[PDB]
Symmetry: C3
Subunit: 761 residues, 3 copies
């Protein structure tokens, strides 16, 4: 997790200001009043968890399926924007009519030189993909994907009444995707919708051509409708010359929505009553995270009012459509009440009783089991591979994670984190300007870390507010998405609490008063200073969502919070291949234990191995790291290094002996935290394996030199706890979770303190 | 909502869709913020009908063939 | 807005264009506006009528039936 001050926050982390999204640049705080009331449809969203595997290649074909696939592909960062995927796709099937030969040759597969026409059909369907790999020689395909696409028309079932088999399909694993959207994500949505406008007609045409085909004869003679097949689809491809223009339409519905927001009356911003109605927008005004997307792209690209729309006809064609009313996005529009709620609340009491520890937190049970893949490549001799799930490290390590599936529950974490509770004297005097604002989400880490980037750098970029901006455009991307997902998540969750919101320019640089933020209100909070407001008027009135967050009364989490976890043995006997890599290849790696007693080096040196007790190596497998399982413990890692370096900065600053007592107790209580945690980690059964076996090895080392064979001399007290960590080290790296540069940290922190048991055991 | 309700369970557990029930209807109540404005629309179809009646040619009273249909 | 997107592609229809362009100049009444409604006018046309014996035509064959030497 992670925390801020309650009074200050901009001096703690600029990223959660509305102002930073507004690009206010650290200076003046937003406050400007003169307000317009709102309401909630609790706003459009995504899913949150959707780990599943589509079938393709079975010849059913449905654009909504592929839309997810390309969308996920960009979410894999396989190229970049979906829009790029699409323009490059059209660049691909600019091999459109310039290649009649696609028909002439696939029909040649139908056998062929079909001027020798007849009810020729016999058998063969399901792998034109290879003869179409010859079509890849005809249609080179640096991407696997569209090459894997085009097969379908000839072989969805065509000719639907024979050809014939498949008895086989294909594969891909969509994972859960991004939680909340943005400019690029949206244009990717509507772009995916132009593709939606593509493929469905592309199926329907053939769907009727087949009706007009088997005139009988039987399937009738070729070099015709077959030789047709998709020429009409090419015309359908030419029906696709003009959907819209994604950035323009998105910017359009955007800024017109903003005009619907802004106080600014005049003709530049006068949403016509001629069209203030007309469906959709009437609830679409209510969406609010979508509104965050507004202020976001308003932040990046100014406003750039192309206003492709008129005032009414047609201010209709442009908002004919948008992403939620697309199914093309994994993301989906959202009903009324729950918003996206699933976080409880508690708050510190000094019997006064203003909070000093805000408690806002997670809600999430991590995977109970994970399974290794055996990369049995054989077909194609390239990317094509089979994984064949089988038990291995799997079952046993999983059962060992079950206790971790208890003792590292988030509820227990925050509950202990809440137990930090009493601090700076007593009791009853803990208050002093700011107060800690602890928080964190399952999502931001589960995704940004899934991209393999280490979220904490972005987190710190938020903490300083200002972007490091030295990153690769890829990392530039992960940073951006990190930002608006943090921010917006906090926004619309905070919104999920407080019922009412009002629009607020800002002013400052105006830059034409279109720039704007929000201010909120609640009353129940006790007459105490809190944030800039205090509470002022018996009511909040704050720009800043965190402020409304702090005042909220304690509650409970709602969502099923489960990791759901994938399975695939079915699809595995089916596979085939897909962009899978990221796992990656060789399931684990050794870590080397060491210790000294009687002033002698020993170095236990253990692998990897199954370690569990059946050799050897194994080999080969690789298991996926759960995003979640490492993400959560990384939240805590962020806490560890947080209290470490920051309160060490306190060790540097306030040299007051009482403040000395504070840094003492706090750093040494995170110390007792990881202490007792690894402590319970050592009792784990694999931990038991590491204990007995590594101890067996170094006892064998005792037998090395003949005089230090004088029985065990390690065991007294300190050594046991001292090696107890080693169990937490196997549980660390190559348990499939922690990423090293970690035990590193833990080592230094375990050096920071006396540790000991500290008692128990 | 009822179709999405008795997830079963049986009728499924409350403090939810029940606690929902009509919040969406309140949003439906908010779908009703703007039908038209009665006197204005009535006066509108009215007087445009009157322009369809009146001999007066000019632009103030020229029922568009664009929409006489 | 539909139709015209493939309707642009028709070409004998285009011959009809250059033809009546030949007889009656162009005489741009332009009963249409630029958009609303440049819709009502091309709401409809002859091929999308069944009223004509004539009918709209698919993709490839055109009206082919002559060999060559």
């Amino acid at each position: 997790g992670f925390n801020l001050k309650v009074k200050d926050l901009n001096g703690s982390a600029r990223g959660l200001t509305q102002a930073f999204a507004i690009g206010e640049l650290k200076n003046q705080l937003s406050v400007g009043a003169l307000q317009l009331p709102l309401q909630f449809t609790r706003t459009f969203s995504a899913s949150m968890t959707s780990e599943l595997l589509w079938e393709v290649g079975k010849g059913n074909i449905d654009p909504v399926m592929y839309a997810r696939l390309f969308f996920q592909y960009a979410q894999a960062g396989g190229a970049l924007s979906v829009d790029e995927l699409v323009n490059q796709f059209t660049e691909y099937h600019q091999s459109t009519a310039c290649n009649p030969e696609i028909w002439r040759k696939l029909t040649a597969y139908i056998t062929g030189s079909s001027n020798r026409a007849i009810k020729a059909d016999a058998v063969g369907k399901v792998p034109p993909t290879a003869i179409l790999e010859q079509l890849r020689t005809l249609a080179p395909s640096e991407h696997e994907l569209f090459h894997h696409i085009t097969t379908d028309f000839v072989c969805h079932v065509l000719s639907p009444l024979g050809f014939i088999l498949p008895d086989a399909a294909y594969v891909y694993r969509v994972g859960r995707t991004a939680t909340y959207p943005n400019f690029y994500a949206l244009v990717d949505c509507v772009r995916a919708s132009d593709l939606r406008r593509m493929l469905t007609a592309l199926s329907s045409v053939d769907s009727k051509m087949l009706q007009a085909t088997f005139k009988a004869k039987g399937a009738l003679a070729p070099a015709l409708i077959s030789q047709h097949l998709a020429n009409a689809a090419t015309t359908a491809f030419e029906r696709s010359r003009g959907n819209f223009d994604a950035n323009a339409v998105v910017s359009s519905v955007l800024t017109i929505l903003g005009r619907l927001w802004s106080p600014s009356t005049p003709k530049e911003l006068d949403p016509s009553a001629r069209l203030r109605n007309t469906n959709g927008i009437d609830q679409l005004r209510s969406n609010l995270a979508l509104f965050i997307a507004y202020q976001d792209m308003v932040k990046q690209r100014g406003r750039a009012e192309v206003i492709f729309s008129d005032e009414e006809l047609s201010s209709t064609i442009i908002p004919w459509f948008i992403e939620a009313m697309s199914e093309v996005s994994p993301f989906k529009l959202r009903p009324i009440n729950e918003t996206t709620s699933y976080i409880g609340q508690t708050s510190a009491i000094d019997h006064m009783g203003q909070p000093s520890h805000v408690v806002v937190y997670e809600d999430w049970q991590f995977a109970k089991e994970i399974t290794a893949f055996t990369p049995v490549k054989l077909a194609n001799n390239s990317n094509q591979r089979f994984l064949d799930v089988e038990p291995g490290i799997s079952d046993r390590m999983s059962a060992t994670l079950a206790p971790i599936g208890n003792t590292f529950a988030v509820s227990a974490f925050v509950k202990n984190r809440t137990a930090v509770y009493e601090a700076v004297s007593q009791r009853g005097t803990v208050n002093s300007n700011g107060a800690e604002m602890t928080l964190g989400f399952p999502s931001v880490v589960e995704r940004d870390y899934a991209l393999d980037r280490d979220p904490m750098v972005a987190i710190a970029a938020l903490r300083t507010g200002i972007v490091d901006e030295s990153l690769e455009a890829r990392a530039s991307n992960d940073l951006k998405r990190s930002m608006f997902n943090y921010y917006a998540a906090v926004m619309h969750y905070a919104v999920a609490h407080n019922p009412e919101v009002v629009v607020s320019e800002h002013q400052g640089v105006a830059a034409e008063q279109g720039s704007l933020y929000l201010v909120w209100n609640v009353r129940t909070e006790l007459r105490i200073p809190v944030g800039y407001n205090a509470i002022e008027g018996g009511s909040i009135r704050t720009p800043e969502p965190l402020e409304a967050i702090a005042y909220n009364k304690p509650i409970q989490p709602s969502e099923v919070l489960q990791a759901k976890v994938l399975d695939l043995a079915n699809h595995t006997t089916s596979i085939h291949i897909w962009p899978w890599h990221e796992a990656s290849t060789e399931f684990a790696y050794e870590d080397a234990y060491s210790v000294t007693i009687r002033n002698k080096r020993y170095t236990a040196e253990v692998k990897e191995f199954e370690l569990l007790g059946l050799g050897q190596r194994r080999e080969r497998v690789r298991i996926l790291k759960p995003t979640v399982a490492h993400a959560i413990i990384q939240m805590w890692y962020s806490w560890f290094v947080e209290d470490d370096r920051t309160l060490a900065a306190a060790r540097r600053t306030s040299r007051d002996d009482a403040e000395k007592l504070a840094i003492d107790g706090r750093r040494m209580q995170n110390a007792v935290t990881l202490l007792r945690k690894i402590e319970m980690i050592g009792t784990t059964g694999i931990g038991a394996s590491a204990v007995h076996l590594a101890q067996s090895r170094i006892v064998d080392q005792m037998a090395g030199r003949g005089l230090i064979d004088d029985s065990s001399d390690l065991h007294v007290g300190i050594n046991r706890h001292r090696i107890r960590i080693w169990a937490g080290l196997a549980v660390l790296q190559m348990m499939g979770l922690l990423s090293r540069s970690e035990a590193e940290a833990l080592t230094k922190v375990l050096g920071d303190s006396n540790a000991l048991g500290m008692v128990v055991a």
